[PDB]
Amino acid sequence: SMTEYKLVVVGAGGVGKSALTIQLIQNHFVDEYDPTIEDSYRKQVVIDGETCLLDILDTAGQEEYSAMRDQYMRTGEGFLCVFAINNTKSFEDIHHYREQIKRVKDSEDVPMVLVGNKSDLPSRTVDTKQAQDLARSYGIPFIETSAKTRQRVEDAFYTLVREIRQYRLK
């Protein structure tokens, strides 16, 4: 009695993809994780009464032209699209990551959650209203997280599971 969910964490270099994934899985914060390390992590969790196996790919390179990225976008069931709230460029990059994923899926139905990470940093450059507007335009949830303090880390991943579970019934 278990359901599998293949999750992919994408976003510009330095936004906190690794720190979020490691906080979820290993309950610690990494200060300076090698940006080129790409790995998968598995863990069983209970969400809405369901024992869920999360299979999460923490992506490293974000290159347009990558056979491996095409493959993991085909395989991935949901996408955590992460920007940092103090990096406007990373928020602008989100549209490209969504376009790439939709292209690979040949679909509009793609489970995705917009994550504004580094919510513990005081010098915000991306207003929450703008990020909420973007998420509303895409029809996806928006969550601000801190991999440093663990704020909303489980919520971001579990919300993505909920999106996938729902899309399976449509």
Ligand SMILES: CC[n+]1c(NS(=O)(=O)c2ccc(O)c(C(=O)N(CCO)C3CCNCC3)c2)sc2c(Cl)ccc(O)c21
């Ligand atoms: C690793 C298996 N895997 C995938 N396998 S895969 O497409 O062949 C793939 C994708 C990216 C990769 O970098 C790799 C890969 O070669 N690796 C990382 C994943 O284990 C190796 C791992 C050993 N060190 C170098 C990188 C494989 S896709 C995937 C998704 Cl979308 C979610 C969860 C997964 O576990 C997953």
Ligand SMILES: Nc1nc2c(ncn2[C@@H]2O[C@H](COP(=O)(O)OP(=O)(O)O)[C@@H](O)[C@H]2O)c(=O)[nH]1
């Ligand atoms: N203050 C703060 N720093 C973070 C947060 N998440 C990641 N970082 C830091 O930002 C840098 C990049 O994080 P990393 O996870 O390696 O980014 P990735 O390239 O997206 O995998 C590192 O120095 C992290 O310690 C966060 O929520 N808050």
Ligand SMILES: [Mg+2]
């Ligand atoms: Mg990383």
